[PDB]
């Protein structure tokens, strides 16, 4: 049967519904239900791969479907070791399938919460630098390809079986080749606690604002996923941040990681570090594998 899937996805991202086997439910997803499972011959040199599978059911408007596909279409553009990668979509069938790289340990937020005692030290500075570095790497790729994530936060990063952290959710990211910015016209649903002052004020999003968010996820990592500006309301956070407010250094936070935050929170966007700069300052503290797999140390980067 002919559906949006047939036109809106290059058949060069297609894979036979027979190659894809679903096992158990992982959870709800933006446009359908996500399943863990296996995808034969989708990864070069793998006879089999573990993957996450999303199912869009007939019971979803064509509008719904089209947008959903277009969102995935941007994914396609990205090929970075620290971005969750799209493995392909099954388009000739009754429930459209999207096949993503499996991240066995789920979202960085939940993962961080799992480290707490049971209703409060943070990971070791070394574990933390690795996360910070792997997140910064993905973002630097994003920015090199002229995108603004807009929605960077612990809840949007995934953690792989080997504890590698990757950027994961791009429903909110925009193209910025020419302009180097995105301006929000109407109502926005982005959480205010991750938003840069300039973004709260004008609706402007740049890579400088991404770096601001990055600081906040460093803060989330440090506090094992506390709510930023706890004790303030969205109202007060708004006011507080725009007028120069800053998150307090976590109790138990190694100075270094909080210095890094304080630079990502420079009020003047132009005074913040680039994702490349950030990586540079800690690249010598990253587990060996990094050099091989990172975008920082890749050909694309120069
Ligand atoms: C918890 O649910 C999970 C969702 C995942 C996921 N999500 C996902 C999101 C969107 C799509 S399709 C889509 N919709 C909009 C855009 N796109 C591409 C797909 Cl296919 C998967 C992707 C990925 N990616 C990769 N890995 C995942 C692992 C999950 O859990 C296993 C461990 C949890 N665990 C049990 C923790 C301990 O309890």
UniProtKB/Swiss-Prot annotation:
There is a cross-link at residues 184, 187 (Glycyl lysine isopeptide (Lys-Gly) (interchain with G-Cter in ubiquitin)). It comes from the Eukaryota. This is Insulin-like growth factor 1 receptor beta chain. Residues 2-302 are cytoplasmic. ATP binds at residues 26-34, 54. The gene is IGF1R. Residues 20-290 form the Protein kinase domain. The active site is at 151 (proton acceptor). Changing residue 272 to S: In IGF1RES; significant decrease in IGF1-induced DNA synthesis and AKT1 phosphorylation in patient fibroblasts. The modification Phosphoserine is found at residues 294, 298. The modification Phosphotyrosine is found at residues 177, 181-182.
């Amino acid at each position: 049967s002919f559906s949006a899937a047939d036109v809106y996805v290059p058949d060069e991202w297609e894979v036979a519904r027979e190659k894809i086997t679903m096992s158990r439910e992982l959870g709800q997803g933006s446009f359908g239900m996500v399943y863990e499972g296996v995808a034969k011959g989708v990864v070069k040199d793998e006879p089999e791969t573990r993957v996450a599978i999303k199912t869009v059911n007939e019971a979803a408007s064509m509008r719904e479907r089209i947008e959903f596909l277009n969102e995935a279409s941007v994914m396609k553009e990205f090929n970075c070791h620290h971005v969750v990668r799209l493995l392909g979509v099954v388009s000739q069938g009754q429930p459209t399938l999207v096949i993503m790289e499996l991240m066995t340990r789920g979202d960085l937020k939940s993962y961080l919460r799992s480290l707490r005692p049971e209703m409060l030290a943070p990971p070791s500075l070394s574990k933390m630098i690795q996360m910070a570095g792997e997140i910064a790497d993905g973002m630097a790729y994003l920015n090199a390809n002229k995108f603004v994530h807009r929605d960077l936060a612990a809840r949007n990063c995934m953690v792989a079986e080997d504890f590698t952290v990757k950027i994961g959710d791009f429903g909110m990211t925009r193209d910025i080749y020419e302009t180097d910015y995105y301006r929000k016209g109407g109502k926005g649903l982005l959480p205010v606690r991750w938003m840069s002052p300039e973004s709260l004020k004008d609706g402007v999003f740049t890579t400088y604002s991404d770096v601001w968010s990055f600081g906040v996820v460093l803060w989330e990592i440090a506090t094992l996923a506390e709510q930023p500006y706890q004790g303030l309301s969205n109202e007060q956070v708004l006011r507080f941040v725009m007028e120069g407010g800053l998150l307090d250094k976590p109790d138990n936070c190694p100075d270094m990681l909080f210095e890094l935050m304080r630079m990502c929170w420079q009020y003047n966007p132009k005074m913040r570090p680039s994702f490349l700069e950030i990586i540079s300052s800690i690249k010598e503290e990253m587990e060996p594998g990094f050099r091989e797999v990172s975008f920082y140390y890749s050909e694309e980067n120069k």
